[PDB]
Amino acid sequence: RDLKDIPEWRRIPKGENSVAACFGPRGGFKNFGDAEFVEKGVDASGYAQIASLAPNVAALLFGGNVAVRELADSYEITYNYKMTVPKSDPNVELLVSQVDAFK
Amino acid sequence: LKDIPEWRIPKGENSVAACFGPRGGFKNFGDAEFVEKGVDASGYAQIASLAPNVAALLFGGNVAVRELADSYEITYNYKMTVPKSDPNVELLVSQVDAFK
DSSP states (O other), rough: OOOOTGGGGGGOOOOTTHHHHHOOOOOOSSSSSOHHHHHGGGGTHHHHHTTSSSSOHHHHHSSSSSEEEESSSSEEEEEEEEEEETSSSSHHHHHHHHHOOOO | OSSSSOOOOOHHHHHHBHHHOOOOHHHOOHHHHHHHHBSSSEEEHHHHSSOOHHHHHHHHSSEEEEOOEEEEEEEEEEEEEEETTTTHHHHTTBBBBBOO
């Protein structure tokens, strides 16, 4: 298979084809991840803890907003999923400290 | 269910309404049979092929954080474009804002 065959929403960054190859540079929108997560992807120290604070597909569809804009040849879907984690959670900061890390 | 972080798998007894509440302006996805059968609904696996995994959610979309006194409010914003040639995009699109 080839990374170009896999659509972006199904990619998993790992090894040779990691975040830069899957999602492009960090930026204002794609803002999560410091230098070491950008390079190791799901292998970065802390990822598994972080990933526990992100919704599965069933929660994405039923527990958040799904919005559609129809184009000529396509549909553009935007998922907007909000959630609250108590500061007593042992993994919240790991996530937060990775937001907007690009410097 | 009260000890399962909402962000839960809806099936039979504990389905959409119990996990995520009624459909509304924000939680706007799902028709009468999807609200009732949850992940058991006809077509769910097809809709599901057009929704991102966690690694794609964290690295391929926007992550926003608002700090409160005793919690953080996290917001994921994931954009994606599906070709109309995909056999499942209406299956999905027809479920958007389904409530009537």
